[PDB]
Amino acid sequence: KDLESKVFKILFESLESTRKAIAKQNQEKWKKYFILAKRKLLLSQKIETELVLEQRDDIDINSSESVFKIYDLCEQLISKIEYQLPQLESQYSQPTDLDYILEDSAMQTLKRLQDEEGWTEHHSAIYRQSIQSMKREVHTDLLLYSSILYDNLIHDLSIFFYIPREIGNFINNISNPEANQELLYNMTLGLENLLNGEFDSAMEHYAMDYMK
Amino acid sequence: RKDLESKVFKILFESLESTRKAIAKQNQEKWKKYFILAKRKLLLSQKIETELVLEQRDDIDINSLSIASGNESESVFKIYDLCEQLISKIEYQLPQLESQYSQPTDLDYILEDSAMQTLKRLQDEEGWTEHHSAIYRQSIQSMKREVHTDLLLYSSILYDNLIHDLSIFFYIPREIGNFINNISNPTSLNEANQELLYNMTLGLENLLNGEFDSAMEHYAMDYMKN
Amino acid sequence: KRKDLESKVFKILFESLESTRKAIAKQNQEKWKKYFILAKRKLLLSQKIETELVLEQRDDIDINSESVFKIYDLCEQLISKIEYQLPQLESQYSQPTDLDYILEDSAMQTLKRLQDEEGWTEHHSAIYRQSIQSMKREVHTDLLLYSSILYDNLIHDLSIFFYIPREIGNFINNISNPTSLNEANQELLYNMTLGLENLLNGEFDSAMEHYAMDYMK
Amino acid sequence: NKRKDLESKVFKILFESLESTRKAIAKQNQEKWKKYFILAKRKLLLSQKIETELVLEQRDDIDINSLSIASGNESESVFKIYDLCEQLISKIEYQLPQLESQYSQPTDLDYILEDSAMQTLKRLQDEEGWTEHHSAIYRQSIQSMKREVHTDLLLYSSILYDNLIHDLSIFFYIPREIGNFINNISNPTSLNEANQELLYNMTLGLENLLNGEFDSAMEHYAMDYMKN
Amino acid sequence: KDLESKVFKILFESLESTRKAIAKQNQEKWKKYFILAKRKLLLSQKIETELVLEQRDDIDINSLNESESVFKIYDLCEQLISKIEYQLPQLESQYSQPTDLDYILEDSAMQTLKRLQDEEGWTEHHSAIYRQSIQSMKREVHTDLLLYSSILYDNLIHDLSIFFYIPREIGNFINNISNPTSLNEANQELLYNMTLGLENLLNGEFDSAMEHYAMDYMK
Amino acid sequence: DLESKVFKILFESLESTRKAIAKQNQEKWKKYFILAKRKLLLSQKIETELVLEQRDDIDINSLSGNESESVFKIYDLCEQLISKIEYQLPQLESQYSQPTDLDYILEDSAMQTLKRLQDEEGWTEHHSAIYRQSIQSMKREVHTDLLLYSSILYDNLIHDLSIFFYIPREIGNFINNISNPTLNEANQELLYNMTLGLENLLNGEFDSAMEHYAMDYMKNKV
Amino acid sequence: KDLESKVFKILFESLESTRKAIAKQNQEKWKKYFILAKRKLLLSQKIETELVLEQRDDIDINSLNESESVFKIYDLCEQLISKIEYQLPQLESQYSQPTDLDYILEDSAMQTLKRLQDEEGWTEHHSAIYRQSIQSMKREVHTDLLLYSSILYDNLIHDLSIFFYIPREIGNFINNISNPANQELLYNMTLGLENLLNGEFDSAMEHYAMDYMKNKV
Amino acid sequence: KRKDLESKVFKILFESLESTRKAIAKQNQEKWKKYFILAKRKLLLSQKIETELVLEQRDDIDINSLSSVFKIYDLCEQLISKIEYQLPQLESQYSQPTDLDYILEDSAMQTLKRLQDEEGWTEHHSAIYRQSIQSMKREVHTDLLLYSSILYDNLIHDLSIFFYIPREIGNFINNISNPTSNQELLYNMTLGLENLLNGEFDSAMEHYAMDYMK
Secondary structure: OOHHHHHHHHHHHHHHHHHHHHHOOOHHHHHHHHHHHHHHHHHHHHHHHHHHHHOOOOOOOOOOHHHHHHHHHHHHHHHHHHHHHHHHHHHHOOOOHHHHHHHHHHHHHHHHHHOOOOOOHHHHHHHHHHHHHHHHHHHHHHHHHHHHHHHHHHHHOHHHOHHHHHHHHHHHHHHOOOHHHHHHHHHHHHHHHHHOOHHHHHHHHHHHHHHO | OHHHHHHHHHHHHHHHHHHHHHHHHOOOOHHHHHHHHHHHHHHHHHHHHHHHHHHOOOOOOOOOOOOOOOOHHHHHHHHHHHHHHHHHHHHHHHHHHHHHHHOOOHHHHHHOHHHHHHHHHHHOOOOOOHHHHHHHHHHHHHHHHHHHHHHHHHHHHHHHHHHHHOHHHOHHHHHHHHHHHHHHOOHHHHHHHHHHHHHHHHHHHHHHOOHHHHHHHHHHHHHHHO | OHHHHHHHHHHHHHHHHHHHHHHHHHOHHHHHHHHHHHHHHHHHHHHHHHHHHHHOOOOOOOOOOOHHHHHHHHHHHHHHHHHHHHHHHHHHHHOOOHHHHHHHHHHHHHHHHHOOOOOOOHHHHHHHHHHHHHHHHHHHHHHHHHHHHHHHHHHHHHHHHOHHHHHHHHHHHHHHOOOOHHHHHHHHHHHHHHHHHHHHOOHHHHHHHHHHHHHOO | OHHHHHHHHHHHHHHHHHHHHHHHHHOOHHHHHHHHHHHHHHHHHHHHHHHHHHHHOOOOOOOOOOOOOOOOOHHHHHHHHHHHHHHHHHHHHHHHHHHHHHHHOOOHHHHHHOHHHHHHHHHHOOOOOOOHHHHHHHHHHHHHHHHHHHHHHHHHHHHHHHHHHHHOHHHOHHHHHHHHHHHHHOOOOOHHHHHHHHHHHHHHHHHHHHOOHHHHHHHHHHHHHHHO | OOHHHHHHHHHHHHHHHHHHHHHOOOHHHHHHHHHHHHHHHHHHHHHHHHHHHHOOOOOOOOOOOHHHHHHHHHHHHHHHHHHHHHHHHHHHHHHHOOOHHHHHHOHHHHHHHHHHOOOOOOOHHHHHHHHHHHHHHHHHHHHHHHHHHHHHHHHHHHHOHHHOHHHHHHHHHHHHHOOOOHHHHHHHHHHHHHHHHHHHHHOOHHHHHHHHHHHHHHO | OOHHHHHHHHHHHHHHHHHHHHOOHHHHHHHHHHHHHHHHHHHHHHHHHHHHHOOOOOOOOOOOOHHHHHHHHHHHHHHHHHHHHHHHHHHHHHHHHOOOHHHHHOOHHHHHHHHHHOOOOOOOHHHHHHHHHHHHHHHHHHHHHHHHHHHHHHHHHHHHOHHHOHHHHHHHHHHHHOOOOOOHHHHHHHHHHHHHHHHHHHOOHHHHHHHHHHHHHHHHHO | OHHHHHHHHHHHHHHHHHHHHHHOOHHHHHHHHHHHHHHHHHHHHHHHHHHHHOOOOOOOOOOOOOHHHHHHHHHHHHHHHHHHHHHHHHHHHHHOOOOHHHHHHOHHHHHHHHHHOOOOOOOHHHHHHHHHHHHHHHHHHHHHHHHHHHHHHHHHHHHOHHHOHHHHHHHHHHHHHHOOOOOHHHHHHHHHHHHHHOOHHHHHHHHHHHHHHHHOO | OHHHHHHHHHHHHHHHHHHHHHHHHHHHOOOOHHHHHHHHHHHHHHHHHHHHHHHOOOOOOOOOOOOOHHHHHHHHHHHHHHHHHHHHHHHHHHHOOOHHHHHOOHHHHHHHHHHHHOOOOOHHHHHHHHHHHHHHHHHHHHHHHHHHHHHHHHHHHHOOOOOHHHHHHHHHHHHHHOOOOOHHHHHHHHHHHHHHHOOHHHHHHHHHHHHHOO
16 A cells, blocks of 8 residues: 555656756757857858848949958858858767667666556656656757857857948948948958957857856 | 556546647647747847947047038938937837737646646546646646747747848848949949948838838748748 | 068968967867867776676576676666767767868968968978968877876766775775674675766766866866 | 079978988887887876775774674785785885886987987078078977877877776776676675685785786786787 | 162162173174074075975976976075075074173173172162163163164165066066067076076075175174 | 162062053054064065066057057056055054053153152162163063064064965966966966956955954964 | 946946955954044043042142042042043044055045046046045945944943942942941042053953954954 | 936936935934934933942941941932933934935935936936935934034033032042041932932033034
8 A cells, every 4th residue: 555656756756867867967058059059140140241242243344452352251251151050060969968868778767667566557658758858858948048048149249240330330430530441441350250260269258158 | 446546547648638639729829929039039130230330329529520421411310310219119129029929828728727727627536646746747847848849949940031031121231242342333432422321221211110020020921821 | 682571471471370370279169078078988998897897707697686686787788878978979079170170271261362472482381281280280189188187187086986996995894894794795785786877877977077177267 | 593592492401301300200119119108007007096095995994892793804804905905005106206207218209309400400500591480490390290299109108008908907806806796696605705705806916916917917918019 | 878879889880881891792783683684585585486386286297498497497496495494594593602792691790690799788679670680781682683683674675686586577578578579588588587596596696695785784 | 677668669660560561462463563564565565666677668669469458457556556555654654653551651650650759768869760770671672572573473474475475476387387288378377367466465455464364463362 | 238337337346346445444443443432431531530639629838647548649630630631632643543444545546536537438427426435435434433432432331340439439438337447438549540540441441342353243 | 419318317316316415414404312312321321330330339238236328329229210211211212213214215215216217217327326325324324423422522521510429529538638527428419319310410411412502
């Protein structure tokens, strides 16, 4: 009598141990947060840069290096992003310790728990459904906190959005004075910072700080 | 007791299974919350871009020469006025978006009110322990989290699509591409500053006047239907 | 004269190289992930040999004993875990990164731009290529260096997970003491099952993550 | 183009000096294997030390009672084992500064990168069209070569350790003895017999770590790997 | 009657004579001034060098112009510490060694007490006053030592500023790295000026320096 | 016969004043602290001066980095510290000159006492001469005590305050970093740690530490 | 936007730096607590002794055991009056002594202010806020003085009851006149007046104030 | 633009707070009682300890078969009484809320909400507001302790005549200095005790406090 209660207790405390294992994962979870947000930032970069390419008239006459260099930096920043997005995907899908914990190790625990007394096929059903729920909720967590992260570091990375900045500058330069060349220069610069690692490093720094 | 634990178990499971089928039946409000989360992202970007433009305004001083300001001075002051409005607009919008997304739905009724109700009717069953009710609370929480997840997944993909479909309303990148192209032409030098102030005003009012919102709602519903 | 031309081209060569080195230095998150991979790999290989040697001592099983069966089972699981973890650790170690992209593609672009200068000869070009190769090799150096030291420190931090030496110490200490022979036997069985399951259940993997992450900063 | 061939061939001499040093580095195998072995051996002994410390740390003696009924020699065996643990910790504490000293001894690798390289630089500094920028490239390439050597050292010593730790499996007395113990216990009535076997085998394996057989086996296996 | 007046006068005359004998004995003071100020100087030298030293990490056998310089600087630190660790007890000893002033205020004065105790009208009260007057003359001498060593040290910390190489080289290093070309050589150059610094404190240039500045303060 | 009475009355009054001087601890400990702290601040001053002497001067030039930010912030902290010390030293002197009850016990109260004692039988001007001599020596011996226990205090504090001696600690940290693993990481480490050392000298942590340590040394003797 | 919030945060953090500086200045705090308490004590003491003296009855050319019973005490009163008249202004010189604290709140505060006046978006209104908060901290350190010095005084008047010879002696006189004898008054008096003149009262006070400086914190 | 917005929002915080200052100045010229209460409290506890210690000299030496003051000892404990009554009275009198306590609680915290309603007005101005109000509170408290102290230091001289006990020990040693007639002691001191009980003291104290603050 009251063996039902004891078996239930075993199931519950097993599942809770798995939950605590899950909560201890931090480094790969954060690396994945960071991958999702960075991917969003890089798709907006590739779209902004494709828009400013499009506005270039292929001159075909039919009877300055300051901008050719700008358009050049544009094209190879597209090339950078195009290399980088598959690598972020790849990195994202690499298996982690948590995976093993939730698959093989959790199945091993199941088998042992089934050899107890009073453990039915229903207890197994409940155990399996809980582990499937935990597996899914890992993705829940990734999607949630990477959205929150992206929202925060779109504020923090403002300094790198050089087009809004150069336009605000340039219409301030009407009423507070050469301006064409100033814009070409600040644009070249903001490009370079996007290509030369200054951006990938800024993002590493910010998200890291967030994790501490 | 042989059939007792088996069938208390079966009642718990069938309760939960019906609730799951109910969740599938209320796949209706989901489209509105998808659209909200996507739209909130599009606006957070717009607000930040605009704020950045406004943040360059250096004031006008005795030390500001302000030479070469013809009729462009009033263009520029309307640009700052528009920008200020667009911020005040996005600032009013965003909490209405929160208020909408947060509002109670059919799904919430399935998973909250009615879930606890069914719980109480289940407590008054033979051989129902508090462990059974913990398992009920757990599976319902997971169904909440499964719905949350569908929200975040679909809305992220929606956004990925919208940033393509709304190519046209991103006036700032296009106008910069055009300004430098227009120094690259021989003829377009004089027209350049004017054209920039004008198409910028255009872009700001397209975001302000309802056009961008409406195209957003179109492309979104189009994506959802297919 | 042409002397100042030579100094101009030498200063440009140097400053492009120095820009490249500053860029390598900032690539810090991946360099740590790799340090930690190496330290973890050594820790785990030693766990595997320790566990395999406890297994080599087992009688061939009866074909065609209760707690000791549990313990042997755990040993086999832990070996499966480690044989799962190791190929993955190699994969993550070889996973390319932005450092690779600086060291190959951005460098070749800067060389195209540089090799179109005032007095830039193909010898300046050869030195530029070599210096790039040397930074790429020095990254590897630092991995081996910093991973060596990190492991030296982790072995001490992680001392409480080394359940084998501690449980043999404990066992002889309480056969020597007035404590009985069964209390000794049962205490060893218990403490071995525990050391094993903390090796198995993430507790060691979490401790290692925690300590190594604390070392950075 | 008198100064063209000047600049071109003062670059050429630089390349050829550097490449000569590189070739002299490549033929330095036997003398590297000494440093390989010292690094591998140091890590092996640091491990041995920690594992023995961890044994010794579980020592908490309780005084016997006037009432104690127990019998046997087991406490004498255990105290001798503790003694041998202290002797091993001593041995290792002694021989680590040795290894440091041996590694610190300068080799003909050191002579090619240090004495000999600085001696070639000075003659290159009396060359026509040579400038301190050339000298900076010289110093830079040499220090890159020192670093390449270091990489060789860390890499090959790590691989050698990984192989040694299997070669030396027989001396790892303490997992092996917890093994033999657990395997005996399943056959009951042999429990006291198994305690005796364990005390005896710990004593032996401690002696084999203490008495220099372990150091011999280590050097022997490292040689066998060097040849292959 | 007229007798305690006589006893009193002889007590006062004896004490005044001791006082005039203390005055001619200015020699010993200067030496002890130098001892006390020099000991304070070497205490601070010790603490600075120990702090520089406390930052050396243990040598990792994997760890690999600078290395040679930093090794030989650390050795110069350890040499300076040993020099001061013996130089200090040497200085205590020199300060303790008996003097003609010590003699004139212990032996000479107690001989005189014995003599004065066989006089007509010499109560023990008289002898208590005598011992207290003598201990007071000792404390005047000690006050003199502490006063003038304090002032002397105050002055020597300026006069000897050029041996305070360590803030000096901090300053040259930050100014150098605050410039374009200096940075290149900065890490070498402090390595040099530090070494020289540690040598001038050890080779004896500073002990001769100190001694000569003290010669001037006393003259 | 009775001259023992007059000598004993003399001795007794002098013991009164001596025990009274003994009970005057608070201002004693504060004057110890003043003399100590003064010396520590004179040393700090010379250090900071010496680092500023190595900064180059300022003229019409091209006006030429992040280092420049760090280095010029340190130079400004230096000028700050020097101003702090040049303010505190005259304060410390004026705090030391301030008179105490001890002054009164050894001047007005004593002269008063001797005038009372010059009204007694057996009392002579030679006893008055001894009274003045003894008072004058206790007057001098106060000073002696100040010199002695300030010397000892300083020799202790120069150890307990070791953590604020940032210049030697950072030059040692620097040379330890270079040649061994970790370039301009060490240069940054120097600038940061120098900045924090100067601020801890400026923010009161050092004055608070001194006021705590010499406190402790007092509580021992209590 | 962010600029406003950040310039506010910089204002607040500077002000709270000053806050934590004043927090650490306990020595001169207690010096001034003590000075104020002691001034009150000595004032009441002076007025008591002057009221004793006001009944001396002017003597001059007049009528030639009790000389030691009245004259010694009238003298000891004249001297305690002397001593108190010496001590009071010394206490006011001591209280007015500048301190590191003044430095914190004046020269240092104005240096930092000047250094904030060339931050981004710093307005003369920020500066007026700053000076207002400085003058506030300056006023509150006063408040701290007044509060603790009153609380102290109330402790000391009880802790120091044994030096209050004059109510005590009127008591011990009227009690022995109800009993079966009087000169005890004159005797114990002289002793009380001496204990207030010889330093016993002063050093008793220094002791209790030390004790409170310690245990209260 | 918003440079002028910032000028104005700081302008409104300034002028609001200065209104509250000018309120405090004039309504402080009214709060004279608190001063007087705290001073009285100190006067009375001084009185209590002095009376206590004269009473503390009760030994009741038992006599044996070998062969007015009480009135006074009574007056003593009567005054210890009057005082132990009067102290909690005075503390309650001190704790009562007045106009200021409202001007810096309610009239301030309400004009707060009003200031929050203003545009451009964030939570940092709300924190500056609250902190300036606490500084005003503490400045009023300063005022309180300050002028109560000075008041006490004057009152000690003003009530010099009621300090009967040093007066009468002085008269006794004066009357023993010139051998005459003890009885004058008991009479004069009884007189002073009744001066401290009948309320000439409390009333002369009030008159001198008011008379000083005029």
